[PDB]
């Protein structure tokens, strides 16, 4: 990291802009959606600018591991398989209601505990 992000002055958020209404490319060519608005809010509250890094969906977790992005906010279902490799925020979208079915989370490298705690605070505030 959080201190490193604040020092850099920007948050790099990975997603795959092919999943409306969460992320998509609009009639103007800009990446927009629910997850973009959320990325912006987290950046705003960290005091930093946002850079969205668009990539193919399968590329996200490898990008997060190699530190090309700080977080994934890309309609990503919290799963036990993915918890082997990354940490998730608390869910921010409940596809099925009453916490059933797919719950979307923000993926963070397991080492970045500070950043995950902060993201969880933002989510509760929202």
Ligand X SMILES: NC(=[NH2+])NCCC[C@H](N)C(=O)O
The binding site for ligand X (CB under 6 A) comprises 15-16, 18-19, 23, 57, 74-77, 102
Q: What does the alpha-carbon distance between residue 77 and residue 1 come to, in Å, rounded to a whole number?
A: 24
Q: How many CA atoms lie within 13 A of 117 on its CB side?
A: 6
At its nearest, how many Å lie between ligand X and the CB of residue 16? 4
Name the residue nearer to ligand X (CB basis): 84 or 125.
Answer: 84
Name the residue nearer to ligand X (CB basis): 63 or 121.
Answer: 63
Q: Shortest CA distance to 73 belongs to which of 8, 29, 12?
A: 12
At its nearest, how many Å lie between ligand X and the CB of residue 85? 13
At its nearest, how many Å lie between ligand X and the CB of residue 95? 8
Name the residue nearer to ligand X (CB basis): 47 or 96.
Answer: 96
Name the residue nearer to ligand X (CB basis): 74 or 89.
Answer: 74
Residue nearest to ligand X (CB): 19
Using CA atoms, how far residue 92 sits from 26, 29, 119, 120, in Å, is 23, 26, 11, 10
At its nearest, how many Å lie between ligand X and the CB of residue 36? 11
Q: Which residues pair with 25 in a beta bridge?
A: 31
Task: Answer whether 46's CB lies under 8 Å from 11's CB.
Answer: yes
């Amino acid at each position: 990291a959080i201190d490193e992000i604040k020092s850099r002055g920007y948050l790099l958020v990975g997603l795959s802009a092919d999943f409306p209404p969460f992320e998509f490319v609009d009639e103007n060519g800009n990446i927009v959606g629910f997850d973009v608005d959320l990325a912006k809010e987290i950046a705003r509250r960290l005091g930093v600018e946002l850079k969205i890094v668009d990539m193919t969906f399968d590329g996200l977790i490898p990008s997060l591991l190699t530190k090309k992005i700080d977080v994934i906010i890309s309609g990503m279902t919290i799963t036990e398989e993915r918890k082997k490799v990354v940490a998730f925020s608390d869910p921010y979208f409940d596809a099925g209601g009453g916490g059933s079915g797919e719950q979307y989370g923000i993926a963070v490298r397991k080492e970045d505990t500070d950043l995950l705690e902060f993201i969880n605070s933002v989510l509760r505030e929202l």
